[PDB]
Design a protein around this motif. Structure first.
Motif, PDB file in Angstrom:
ATOM      1  N   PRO A   1      20.328  33.941  46.982  1.00  0.00           N
ATOM      2  CA  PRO A   1      20.469  34.628  45.691  1.00  0.00           C
ATOM      3  C   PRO A   1      21.667  35.534  45.387  1.00  0.00           C
ATOM      4  O   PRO A   1      22.379  35.857  46.326  1.00  0.00           O
ATOM      5  CB  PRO A   1      19.187  35.466  45.591  1.00  0.00           C
ATOM      6  CG  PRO A   1      18.431  35.226  46.887  1.00  0.00           C
ATOM      7  CD  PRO A   1      19.445  34.685  47.871  1.00  0.00           C
ATOM      8  N   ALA A   2      21.887  35.835  44.098  1.00  0.00           N
ATOM      9  CA  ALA A   2      22.963  36.761  43.661  1.00  0.00           C
ATOM     10  C   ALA A   2      24.316  36.049  43.728  1.00  0.00           C
ATOM     11  O   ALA A   2      24.332  34.853  44.079  1.00  0.00           O
ATOM     12  CB  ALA A   2      22.930  38.055  44.450  1.00  0.00           C
ATOM     13  N   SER A   3      25.403  36.734  43.366  1.00  0.00           N
ATOM     14  CA  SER A   3      26.745  36.125  43.557  1.00  0.00           C
ATOM     15  C   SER A   3      27.297  36.734  44.846  1.00  0.00           C
ATOM     16  O   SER A   3      27.799  37.874  44.780  1.00  0.00           O
ATOM     17  CB  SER A   3      27.652  36.394  42.372  1.00  0.00           C
ATOM     18  OG  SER A   3      26.972  36.165  41.149  1.00  0.00           O
ATOM     19  N   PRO A   4      27.229  36.056  46.016  1.00  0.00           N
ATOM     20  CA  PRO A   4      27.654  36.678  47.271  1.00  0.00           C
ATOM     21  C   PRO A   4      29.151  36.989  47.196  1.00  0.00           C
ATOM     22  O   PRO A   4      29.920  36.132  46.795  1.00  0.00           O
ATOM     23  CB  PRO A   4      27.324  35.651  48.361  1.00  0.00           C
ATOM     24  CG  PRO A   4      26.346  34.707  47.689  1.00  0.00           C
ATOM     25  CD  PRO A   4      26.720  34.701  46.219  1.00  0.00           C
ATOM     26  N   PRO A   5      29.572  38.208  47.585  1.00  0.00           N
ATOM     27  CA  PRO A   5      30.972  38.608  47.453  1.00  0.00           C
ATOM     28  C   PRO A   5      32.021  37.961  48.364  1.00  0.00           C
ATOM     29  O   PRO A   5      31.728  37.680  49.513  1.00  0.00           O
ATOM     30  CB  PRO A   5      30.929  40.105  47.772  1.00  0.00           C
ATOM     31  CG  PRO A   5      29.701  40.289  48.629  1.00  0.00           C
ATOM     32  CD  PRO A   5      28.713  39.267  48.110  1.00  0.00           C
ATOM     33  N   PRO A   6      33.246  37.719  47.855  1.00  0.00           N
ATOM     34  CA  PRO A   6      34.347  37.204  48.684  1.00  0.00           C
ATOM     35  C   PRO A   6      34.719  38.335  49.649  1.00  0.00           C
ATOM     36  O   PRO A   6      34.612  39.482  49.244  1.00  0.00           O
ATOM     37  CB  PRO A   6      35.447  37.038  47.634  1.00  0.00           C
ATOM     38  CG  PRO A   6      34.699  36.846  46.349  1.00  0.00           C
ATOM     39  CD  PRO A   6      33.614  37.887  46.450  1.00  0.00           C
ATOM     40  N   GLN A   7      35.175  38.019  50.868  1.00  0.00           N
ATOM     41  CA  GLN A   7      35.385  39.141  51.827  1.00  0.00           C
ATOM     42  C   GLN A   7      36.465  38.936  52.895  1.00  0.00           C
ATOM     43  O   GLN A   7      37.011  37.819  52.984  1.00  0.00           O
ATOM     44  CB  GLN A   7      34.060  39.577  52.429  1.00  0.00           C
ATOM     45  CG  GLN A   7      33.296  38.441  53.089  1.00  0.00           C
ATOM     46  CD  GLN A   7      31.873  38.825  53.405  1.00  0.00           C
ATOM     47  OE1 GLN A   7      31.441  39.950  53.159  1.00  0.00           O
ATOM     48  NE2 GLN A   7      31.126  37.882  53.951  1.00  0.00           N
ATOM     49  N   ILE A   8      36.739  39.989  53.673  1.00  0.00           N
ATOM     50  CA  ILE A   8      37.847  40.002  54.678  1.00  0.00           C
ATOM     51  C   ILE A   8      37.608  39.107  55.911  1.00  0.00           C
ATOM     52  O   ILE A   8      36.492  39.184  56.461  1.00  0.00           O
ATOM     53  CB  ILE A   8      38.063  41.469  55.094  1.00  0.00           C
ATOM     54  CG1 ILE A   8      37.992  42.417  53.894  1.00  0.00           C
ATOM     55  CG2 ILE A   8      39.357  41.641  55.872  1.00  0.00           C
ATOM     56  CD1 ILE A   8      39.182  42.345  52.964  1.00  0.00           C
ATOM     57  N   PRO A   9      38.578  38.269  56.387  1.00  0.00           N
ATOM     58  CA  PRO A   9      38.388  37.540  57.637  1.00  0.00           C
ATOM     59  C   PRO A   9      38.610  38.593  58.732  1.00  0.00           C
ATOM     60  O   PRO A   9      39.547  39.367  58.623  1.00  0.00           O
ATOM     61  CB  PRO A   9      39.461  36.441  57.579  1.00  0.00           C
ATOM     62  CG  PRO A   9      40.534  37.002  56.669  1.00  0.00           C
ATOM     63  CD  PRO A   9      39.810  37.899  55.686  1.00  0.00           C
TER      64      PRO A   9
END
Lengths: 63, 51
Positions: free
Chosen positions: B32-40
């Motif tokens: 669910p939700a819009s999972p956030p883009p994030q740091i490698p």
């Protein structure tokens, strides 16, 4: 479920979760960008541009 | 020996078949939700100055 143009006017459809409530929010949308077309989904970060521009992007990506 | 009108009915019964409502669980989305883009993790600089 699958809803139609007239059946959608009498039902609440959250977009993001945490927007879903108990009595309200009968349904929920599949993805948040469901509202946008196939081409309008190819424009990057369309959320931070003004709308007459993003609409312009759709006519320039086809030329 | 013929058919005659009899007394008016005193009531009407209308039958229909109906099932019931379950509990409200409202399970909105598989993931669910819009999972956030994030740091490698770590990443490291991939560029250096000359000298």
């Amino acid at each position: 479920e699958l809803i139609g143009t007239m059946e959608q006017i009498f039902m609440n459809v959250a977009i993001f979760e945490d927007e879903v409530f108990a009595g309200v929010t009968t349904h929920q949308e599949l993805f948040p960008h469901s509202l946008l077309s196939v081409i309008a989904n190819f424009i990057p970060f369309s959320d931070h541009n003004q709308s007459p521009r993003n609409m312009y992007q759709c006519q320039m990506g086809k030329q | 020996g013929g058919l005659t009108c009899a007394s008016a009915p005193q009531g009407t019964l209308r039958i229909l078949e109906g099932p019931q409502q379950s509990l409200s669980g409202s399970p909105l989305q598989p993931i669910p939700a819009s999972p956030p883009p994030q740091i490698p993790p770590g990443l490291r600089p991939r560029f250096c100055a000359f000298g």
